[PDB]
Design a protein around this ligand. Structure first.
Ligand SMILES: O=C(c1cncc2ccccc12)N1CCC2(CC1)OCc1ccc(Cl)cc12
Ligand SMILES: O=C(c1cncc2ccccc12)N1CCC2(CC1)OCc1ccc(Cl)cc12
Lengths: 301, 301
């Protein structure tokens, strides 16, 4: 029993983290086989931040201009390349601790574990979600660029996020590991801000199932609803629409609990309209939307 | 910026986890140097659970009765000993991945990271707190006994918890690594239940400081209070008393924010009396008590 914001074990990723310096800028890198991946803005100075031309900034750069440090052992950079917003630094040594890995891009609503790192040193791990507005509500201080987000499937590490910057609301923005930003954000100094966010409905439903699985059933009702009528109320509360594919995905959880998906949609509608009346669900006084249906099955089974 | 329930990286501990079988009971063990630590109830059967005599149950046991599996590599058990509620299994091989470690016992109010494991395999990591009633609100399923809780200090792993059982409220109980239970719980079948819990006041204060550090200041007031008058209100709300040593510990945070500790006690008193009026603090609609003052300084600095 119990329900916690549970991250993946981070050992496999800890062994890939290195420090990357270029100029006076130091950040983190990800060392897999004989390549080190890092944010390309490592090559920038305060001057070139309003209108950087990274193609120009990188052509004026040489290999010896990059210091890579795996702990104390310095790795020799024998090649440099830019892939979108990431820099790829070819090193003389293949990481002996390279796990079986994959570079995957995730969808808004999907979750991942973050290994916050500073100077190539792992500091902490936490679970995060890609918000509908393509930002993440992370925990990051100056020096954390290059920290990675990831999921573990079997023995395979699916890297999905590399950290680049903090937006004005205190939220975070970054790229997949191929260097392509999540959301409409750029690695240059601008007045960029996160757009309006919504609630990840299918996740709130997954979390209500987790609650029931844990014996919290006070919010349950005998009523049911149609997907259409549910969606008509959800949108008034800034919730994303629920699709048939979302109800199909919640099928295992519905079977394990004996509560139909549209039954649980009816309970949600009432919670939205009446609130919780000073009660809590799984230790929370608001509706949690950063657990996917998979996250629940994984922790509750 | 940001504030998350952040665990320690778990790599150092992942490399210590093994599987322990005795009879048809399989659970997890912790392998450090040439010793494997695990819950002693591994040696029990359903029959001997109402009145087990572990001294008798272990004398009738032989070394070959214990199968230890580090992944696929079986480790040969050359010795067995009981230390309070833990079993120590001397093995022929010293764990090459043993980190610098220490066995420490923690206090109610202190936090730690949990590496939930099943069949010796790390499944997930999460932050937990030792409650005032000596229980933890963990996340654990059948098969998780022997999972460990720990803190990392520099490069040293301070092990503080080994998981033994689930209580009826869905909360968890266990031992330090010397086999001594946290709280008045025993490793035998009884109607044992968690006693009444309280809120960890100094932690709620630490978390309010984290909020201010993150730009959430709506709950702040110009009023201040005395430690006595604050404690007189807190106890009405089932909060633990605040001591001078607690205010001294919150000194760094008070200095960094310019909010006196008793100023922040005044804000807390008002939150307790009026509630939050539909507002949130660091993404929460209730007052969070599972972050210590150290946890805040570590994540916010
Ligand atoms: O290291 C940080 C940072 C990262 N995350 C959270 C933070 C919170 C407070 C202060 C710093 C951080 N930088 C350094 C690099 C950064 C973002 C902040 O500056 C200017 C800039 C321009 C373009 C990019 Cl593409 C990244 C940056
Ligand atoms: O494996 C679990 C377990 C651990 N934690 C959470 C759980 C939630 C649901 C079901 C099981 C678990 N056992 C097995 C060993 C256990 C506790 C539950 O049974 C009887 C017993 C007697 C004494 C002890 Cl000292 C431990 C046990």
């Amino acid at each position: 029993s119990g329900f916690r914001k549970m991250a993946f074990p981070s050992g496999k990723v800890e062994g890939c983290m290195v420090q990357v310096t270029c100029g006076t800028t130091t950040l983190n890198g990800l060392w897999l086989d004989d390549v080190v991946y890092c944010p390309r803005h490592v090559i920038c100075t305060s001057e070139d931040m309003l209108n950087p031309n990274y193609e120009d900034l990188l052509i004026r750069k040489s290999n010896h201009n990059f210091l890579v440090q795996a702990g104390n052992v310095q790795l020799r950079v024998i090649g440099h390349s830019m892939q979108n917003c990431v820099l790829k630094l070819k090193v003389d040594t293949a990481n002996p601790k390279t796990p079986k890995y994959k570079f995957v891009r995730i969808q808004p609503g999907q979750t991942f574990s973050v290994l916050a790192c500073y100077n190539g040193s792992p500091s902490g791990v936490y679970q995060c979600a890609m918000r509908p507005n393509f930002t993440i509500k992370g925990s990051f201080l100056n020096g954390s660029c290059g920290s990675v987000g990831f999921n573990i499937d079997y023995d395979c590490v699916s890297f999905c996020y590399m950290h680049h910057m903090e937006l004005p609301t205190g939220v975070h923005a970054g790229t997949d590991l191929e260097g392509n930003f999540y959301g409409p954000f750029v690695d240059r100094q601008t007045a960029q801000a996160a757009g309006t966010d919504t609630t990840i409905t299918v996740n709130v439903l997954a979390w209500l199932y987790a609650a029931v699985i844990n014996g919290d059933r006070w919010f349950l009702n005998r009523f049911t609803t149609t997907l259409n009528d549910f969606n008509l109320v959800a949108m008034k509360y800034n919730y994303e629409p629920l699709t048939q594919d979302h109800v199909d995905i919640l099928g295992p959880l519905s079977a394990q609990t004996g509560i139909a998906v549209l039954d649980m949609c009816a309970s949600l509608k009432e919670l939205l309209q009446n609130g919780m009346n000073g009660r809590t669900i799984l230790g929370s006084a608001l509706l949690e939307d950063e657990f996917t249906p998979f996250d629940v099955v994984r922790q509750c089974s």
